[PDB]
Amino acid sequence: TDKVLQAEQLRQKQLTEDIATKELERKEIEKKRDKIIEALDVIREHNLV
């Protein structure tokens, strides 16, 4: 039971670290779109008139 304990604790520790890593990854992807939204905003200078 204690071996199962420690193995699953290390397991979920790695899982938690990986989840935080993926959260960092998606936050960086959300940082990447800033250039795209700013580019298409500074292109957006003409509308119907």
Place this chain on the structure above:
Amino acid sequence: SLYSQRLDVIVRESLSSLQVKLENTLALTYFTTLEEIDEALISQDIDEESKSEMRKERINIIKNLSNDITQLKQLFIEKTELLDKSSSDLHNVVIIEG
């Protein structure tokens, strides 16, 4: 591993023979028979038939006790030397150096 599991078998069989001898030497009451012959010699008797055969049965129970000691010596020295054989399998088959 073979000699180790073999040694465990030796341990269990040693416990078996130990229980044998703790019930035969220790638990059985040859001592009370010795006391009974002592009381029968305290009992006054025609020493022709009685005390001669009382002494012969003293020799018989002392012979039984010596058989018990013989069991002790033979089986325990035997299994002890078997433990020593397993020890030379263990303590004298070692790899360290290279």
Place this chain on the structure above:
Amino acid sequence: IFTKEDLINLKLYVRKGLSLPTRQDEVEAYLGYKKIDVAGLEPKDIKLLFDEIHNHALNWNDVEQAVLQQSLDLDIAAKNIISTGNEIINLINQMPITLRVKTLLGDITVASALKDILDDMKGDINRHQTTTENVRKKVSDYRITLTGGELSSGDKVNGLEPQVKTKYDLMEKSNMRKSIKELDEKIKEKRQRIEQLKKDYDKFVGLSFTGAIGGIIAMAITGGIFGAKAENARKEKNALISEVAELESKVSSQRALQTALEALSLSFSDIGIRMVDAESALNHLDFMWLSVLNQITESQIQFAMINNALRLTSFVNKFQQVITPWQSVGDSARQLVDIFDEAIKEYKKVY
């Protein structure tokens, strides 16, 4: 001494072993897959493992039925030996000193035919030794079949519990969850490279089309070279897309397959815990059986001493040598019958 909760854990192991897949598709559904690409942990190997353990349970149901048979046999051995032995060989407690100084009982060695009944019961006791040694052989060989070593039949088996422990060590380390991590890293590195190639390829077709639409020889040279290279690099690139998608379909799918292997290793760890429980069970059990055979031999050595020279106090001592081990035999036997009896109600209460 030996307990019934040992036998409770034994029946837990029985229910575990009878709950095992046997056929290949049964194992594969129980695995949840058909392919692992891991040596020592292949689905056929795990199927063979389950054949070993399930047939080990299909041994033990019958062997434990034989344990129940020898339970009956030791019960009736206790009854018959306690009765006949204690009755007849406590009737001859009577020896006053008057005969004990003069008779020299080995002379008259009525009761002589009654001692022949005792020698018939002695041969029956030797038969009980035979049966008890056979069942102890069954128990200890079943233990070695679990634990490991040379069988008394003469087979150096490895024991199924260390084999299961070894495959548990595989599913602990050679399960290669770190390789699942590194192969997902391989996926994301190849995927990053080929999506760089995707963005590059969009710029490739853009620049190739600009080099096309200029003029006559511009069309010629650029549509010749990169008009073909766009299709070629695109098809190769989409083949790479398919390859990394299959790696996702293999080893990012083996993330979840690895998780199923981890739950399987959890189940195997449970099975190994209950094997350790059965190991202690067979430890206390086989030590009891050894004690039984011990006290039988304790009786039989002094039974070999019996002759027609059974004198007065010589036969008093021989009388004592007879009656001494069978008291402990009956004590252990009645306690053992109690162990047999109390586990019976445990099934309907729990199972």
Place this chain on the structure above:
Amino acid sequence: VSSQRALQTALEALSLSFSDIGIRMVDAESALNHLDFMWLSVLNQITESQI
């Protein structure tokens, strides 16, 4: 010699095998030590008789 990277690795496994062989030669050396000392003891006691 970048092929002798792997050839060097094969030489390293060969040197591993040679180290194994040398370990077992040391084992045979102790074997012949105890053995030849026994043989010397045999010839000793023969000479003890013969003198």
Place this chain on the structure above:
Amino acid sequence: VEAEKLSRAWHIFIHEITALQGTSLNEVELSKPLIKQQIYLESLIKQL
């Protein structure tokens, strides 16, 4: 080390049986090392 602990107690036992062979002198001296080994073994039964 474990086997030396075990077999050393058996050389303790052979030194006990070295102190044996009291032929027919007395009777009440006998089973004192026997009960000592008995209780040490019963501890050793529980040490199993």
